[PDB]
Design a protein around this motif. Structure first.
Motif, PDB file in Angstrom:
ATOM      1  N   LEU A  62      -8.079   3.962   4.164  1.00  0.00           N
ATOM      2  CA  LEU A  62      -7.207   3.044   4.893  1.00  0.00           C
ATOM      3  C   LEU A  62      -7.186   3.353   6.389  1.00  0.00           C
ATOM      4  N   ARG A  63      -7.052   4.635   6.721  1.00  0.00           N
ATOM      5  CA  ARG A  63      -6.983   5.080   8.111  1.00  0.00           C
ATOM      6  C   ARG A  63      -8.221   4.674   8.898  1.00  0.00           C
ATOM      7  N   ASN A  64      -9.400   4.906   8.324  1.00  0.00           N
ATOM      8  CA  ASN A  64     -10.669   4.644   9.013  1.00  0.00           C
ATOM      9  C   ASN A  64     -11.028   3.156   9.161  1.00  0.00           C
ATOM     10  N   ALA A  84      10.015   5.751  18.161  1.00  0.00           N
ATOM     11  CA  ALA A  84      11.219   6.444  17.698  1.00  0.00           C
ATOM     12  C   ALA A  84      10.917   7.694  16.855  1.00  0.00           C
ATOM     13  N   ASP A  85       9.726   7.755  16.254  1.00  0.00           N
ATOM     14  CA  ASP A  85       9.328   8.879  15.402  1.00  0.00           C
ATOM     15  C   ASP A  85       8.869  10.036  16.259  1.00  0.00           C
ATOM     16  N   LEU A  86       8.138   9.714  17.324  1.00  0.00           N
ATOM     17  CA  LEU A  86       7.740  10.690  18.333  1.00  0.00           C
ATOM     18  C   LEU A  86       8.941  11.139  19.168  1.00  0.00           C
ATOM     19  N   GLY A 112       9.552   6.794  -3.304  1.00  0.00           N
ATOM     20  CA  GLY A 112       9.295   7.160  -1.911  1.00  0.00           C
ATOM     21  C   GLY A 112       9.903   6.160  -0.953  1.00  0.00           C
ATOM     22  N   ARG A 113       9.180   5.888   0.134  1.00  0.00           N
ATOM     23  CA  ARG A 113       9.621   4.954   1.176  1.00  0.00           C
ATOM     24  C   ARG A 113       9.316   3.477   0.880  1.00  0.00           C
ATOM     25  N   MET A 114       8.537   3.215  -0.167  1.00  0.00           N
ATOM     26  CA  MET A 114       8.132   1.839  -0.506  1.00  0.00           C
ATOM     27  C   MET A 114       9.150   1.108  -1.382  1.00  0.00           C
ATOM     28  N   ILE A 129      -2.104  13.833  -1.820  1.00  0.00           N
ATOM     29  CA  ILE A 129      -2.377  12.562  -1.159  1.00  0.00           C
ATOM     30  C   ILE A 129      -2.013  12.557   0.327  1.00  0.00           C
ATOM     31  N   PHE A 130      -0.816  13.034   0.657  1.00  0.00           N
ATOM     32  CA  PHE A 130      -0.307  12.960   2.032  1.00  0.00           C
ATOM     33  C   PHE A 130      -0.552  14.235   2.834  1.00  0.00           C
ATOM     34  N   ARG A 131      -0.958  15.292   2.127  1.00  0.00           N
ATOM     35  CA  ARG A 131      -1.346  16.583   2.714  1.00  0.00           C
ATOM     36  C   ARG A 131      -0.145  17.394   3.197  1.00  0.00           C
ATOM     37  N   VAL A 135       3.096  -1.848   9.218  1.00  0.00           N
ATOM     38  CA  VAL A 135       3.542  -0.499   8.907  1.00  0.00           C
ATOM     39  C   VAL A 135       4.944  -0.282   9.486  1.00  0.00           C
ATOM     40  N   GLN A 136       5.563   0.832   9.081  1.00  0.00           N
ATOM     41  CA  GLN A 136       6.947   1.178   9.426  1.00  0.00           C
ATOM     42  C   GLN A 136       7.951   0.449   8.539  1.00  0.00           C
ATOM     43  N   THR A 137       8.550   1.209   7.622  1.00  0.00           N
ATOM     44  CA  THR A 137       9.455   0.700   6.596  1.00  0.00           C
ATOM     45  C   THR A 137      10.414  -0.348   7.148  1.00  0.00           C
ATOM     46  N   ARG A 138      10.957  -0.077   8.333  1.00  0.00           N
ATOM     47  CA  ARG A 138      11.920  -0.977   8.965  1.00  0.00           C
ATOM     48  C   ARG A 138      11.292  -2.240   9.514  1.00  0.00           C
ATOM     49  N   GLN A 144      -1.479   5.574  11.373  1.00  0.00           N
ATOM     50  CA  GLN A 144      -2.205   6.259  10.299  1.00  0.00           C
ATOM     51  C   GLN A 144      -1.283   6.734   9.148  1.00  0.00           C
ATOM     52  N   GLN A 145      -0.208   5.972   8.935  1.00  0.00           N
ATOM     53  CA  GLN A 145       0.760   6.185   7.861  1.00  0.00           C
ATOM     54  C   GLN A 145       0.961   4.933   7.010  1.00  0.00           C
ATOM     55  N   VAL A 146       1.259   5.160   5.727  1.00  0.00           N
ATOM     56  CA  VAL A 146       1.827   4.170   4.811  1.00  0.00           C
ATOM     57  C   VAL A 146       3.334   4.493   4.685  1.00  0.00           C
ATOM     58  N   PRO A 147       4.161   3.578   4.142  1.00  0.00           N
ATOM     59  CA  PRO A 147       3.914   2.249   3.585  1.00  0.00           C
ATOM     60  C   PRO A 147       3.170   1.297   4.518  1.00  0.00           C
ATOM     61  N   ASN A 156      -3.155  12.396  19.578  1.00  0.00           N
ATOM     62  CA  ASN A 156      -4.090  11.841  18.589  1.00  0.00           C
ATOM     63  C   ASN A 156      -3.608  10.632  17.778  1.00  0.00           C
ATOM     64  N   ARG A 157      -2.302  10.405  17.750  1.00  0.00           N
ATOM     65  CA  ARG A 157      -1.730   9.346  16.925  1.00  0.00           C
ATOM     66  C   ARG A 157      -1.094   8.230  17.742  1.00  0.00           C
ATOM     67  N   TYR A 158      -0.069   8.569  18.518  1.00  0.00           N
ATOM     68  CA  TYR A 158       0.772   7.558  19.160  1.00  0.00           C
ATOM     69  C   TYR A 158       0.183   7.012  20.438  1.00  0.00           C
ATOM     70  N   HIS A 201       0.829  -1.203   0.000  1.00  0.00           N
ATOM     71  CA  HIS A 201       0.000   0.000   0.000  1.00  0.00           C
ATOM     72  C   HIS A 201       0.860   1.247   0.000  1.00  0.00           C
ATOM     73  N   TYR A 202       0.739   1.997  -1.090  1.00  0.00           N
ATOM     74  CA  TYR A 202       1.491   3.217  -1.309  1.00  0.00           C
ATOM     75  C   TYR A 202       0.949   3.877  -2.573  1.00  0.00           C
ATOM     76  N   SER A 203       1.534   5.015  -2.945  1.00  0.00           N
ATOM     77  CA  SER A 203       1.213   5.667  -4.203  1.00  0.00           C
ATOM     78  C   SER A 203       2.180   5.195  -5.283  1.00  0.00           C
TER      79      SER A 203
HETATM   80  N1  LIG Z   1       7.931   6.189  10.162  1.00  0.00           N
HETATM   81  C1  LIG Z   1       7.840   6.281   8.716  1.00  0.00           C
HETATM   82  C2  LIG Z   1       6.398   6.520   8.257  1.00  0.00           C
HETATM   83  C3  LIG Z   1       6.347   6.881   6.776  1.00  0.00           C
HETATM   84  C4  LIG Z   1       5.781   8.255   6.508  1.00  0.00           C
HETATM   85  O1  LIG Z   1       6.554   9.435   6.631  1.00  0.00           O
HETATM   86  N2  LIG Z   1       4.512   8.258   6.124  1.00  0.00           N
HETATM   87  C5  LIG Z   1       3.983   9.103   5.072  1.00  0.00           C
HETATM   88  C6  LIG Z   1       4.156   8.447   3.711  1.00  0.00           C
HETATM   89  S1  LIG Z   1       5.765   8.777   2.952  1.00  0.00           S
HETATM   90  C7  LIG Z   1       2.527   9.353   5.337  1.00  0.00           C
HETATM   91  O2  LIG Z   1       1.578   8.294   5.232  1.00  0.00           O
HETATM   92  N3  LIG Z   1       2.241  10.611   5.682  1.00  0.00           N
HETATM   93  C8  LIG Z   1       1.019  11.001   6.359  1.00  0.00           C
HETATM   94  C9  LIG Z   1       1.276  11.531   7.748  1.00  0.00           C
HETATM   95  O3  LIG Z   1       2.346  11.282   8.354  1.00  0.00           O
HETATM   96  O4  LIG Z   1       0.408  12.228   8.322  1.00  0.00           O
HETATM   97  C10 LIG Z   1       8.437   5.042   8.106  1.00  0.00           C
HETATM   98  O5  LIG Z   1       9.560   4.670   8.502  1.00  0.00           O
HETATM   99  O6  LIG Z   1       7.861   4.377   7.215  1.00  0.00           O
END
Ligand SMILES: N[C@H](CCC(=O)N[C@@H](CS)C(=O)NCC(=O)O)C(=O)O
Ligand SMILES: N[C@H](CCC(=O)N[C@@H](CS)C(=O)NCC(=O)O)C(=O)O
Lengths: 221, 221
Positions: free
Chosen positions: A43-45, B99-101, A13-15, A218-220, A65-68, A52-55, B129-131, A7-9
């Protein structure tokens, strides 16, 4: 059985290193392209996205979730993460330096249009002066054909991926590192990578003005 | 065997989460404090740092650099990284979010008082709201004392660490999370964490003017 679903665009990017590592391990996967902000909102809802993030990758009954988290899991499953924890340490150490330089390159196209020429110069400096010598040093040190364990690992995958983006930004930067060129050739010659490198593969192009504005919607941001 | 040896300045920085994990896992260590830019150049000249940066830990005959390499090695060595590949993925997922927070929090004091109003408000909104909901959710689902597998993992450690920094910044953010709050109390009372929390321990204070000025001259950024 099931293919992992990414799941990504429709961008790198990170995918992207995820795609590379799956395709280097010969794993077939599906992609579900986020084309809008609404697609991600959906996806979020549905509660598919922990932070609430992709990948996001659906793999083995898990919504990861979380690239790592994902890369790590994939590397382990397909035996590209070494044989023991001392090997993981060297592997983790190498790839986190590759991630550091790779982060610079990933964020470059999202830089302010004028800020970019300075940002590149730092990439040219850190590549020539820091990371490339580090990896050339490891190869010369043990005389072997792969980074860790005398055996192909994710570390080999991630580095060559980087060499391809460096080549795009500055073809000269690898010129004085003949063990990295030799690793780039060996890895690229591998049946799965060679195929992922050919046209028509799920390997993605650089950012352009089209996908850069696609991404802002997409990501705002 | 030799105590793990920690190379850093006398600050929290990128080393503090290593300090917590080692302490939670009962591991006595030595800290060789970098006090100048000349102290850092020496490690660089002696070939001690793969990417010319710290944190660096000397452990088990390695000169380990990259916070995540170090952290991952210690977790696995001390059985705080899950029972198998699937549980690792849950932990990895959690601690990458944590780790992101934490990274937002880490950079805030180095960010000048101009953007400090903006950067702190983002920590606030995302924490609330997220973590915090994500981890409250996890604790809610299984009703167990620990995040993963009804047993102390490194995730509990990195989370409760986090809950101490968030408390420093805004004591109110946890207030609507009964399970996070109770997680903080239980991890803080485990003998080894309780001892690490005691006066006189390797635990470090927040940044201040002096430490920040020292950081500028040591790391030249
Ligand atoms: N912790 C990051 C999360 C990836 C990230 O920065 N998420 C972006 C996509 S490139 C996103 O869904 N942005 C929406 C937001 O963070 O509000 C990772 O290692 O994958
Ligand atoms: N990738 C980071 C590197 C941390 C980092 O940015 N290092 C800084 C201070 S904590 C440093 O040694 N600065 C010198 C330099 O990079 O030139 C890690 O987890 O180890």
């Amino acid at each position: 059985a099931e293919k992992p679903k990414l799941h990504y665009s429709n961008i790198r990017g990170r995918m992207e290193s995820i795609r590379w590592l799956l395709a280097a391990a010969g794993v077939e996967f599906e992609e579900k392209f986020i084309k809008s902000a609404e697609d991600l909102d959906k996806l979020r809802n549905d509660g598919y996205l922990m932070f609430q993030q992709v990948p996001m990758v659906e793999i083995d009954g898990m919504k990861l979730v979380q690239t790592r988290a994902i890369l790590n899991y994939i590397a382990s499953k397909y035996n590209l993460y070494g044989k023991d924890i001392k090997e993981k340490a060297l592997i983790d150490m190498y790839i986190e330096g590759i991630a550091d330089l790779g982060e610079m390159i990933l964020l470059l196209p999202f830089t302010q249009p004028e800020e970019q020429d300075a940002k590149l110069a730092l990439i040219q400096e850190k590549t020539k002066n820091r990371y490339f010598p580090a990896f050339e040093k490891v190869l010369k040190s043990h005389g072997q054909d792969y980074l860790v364990g005398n055996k192909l690992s994710r570390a080999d995958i991630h580095l060559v991926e980087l060499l391809y983006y460096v080549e795009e930004l500055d073809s000269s930067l690898i010129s004085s590192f003949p063990l990295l060129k030799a690793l780039k050739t060996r890895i690229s010659n591998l049946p799965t990578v060679k195929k992922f490198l050919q046209p028509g593969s799920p390997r993605k192009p650089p950012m352009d003005e089209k996908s850069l504005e696609e991404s802002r919607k997409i990501f705002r941001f």
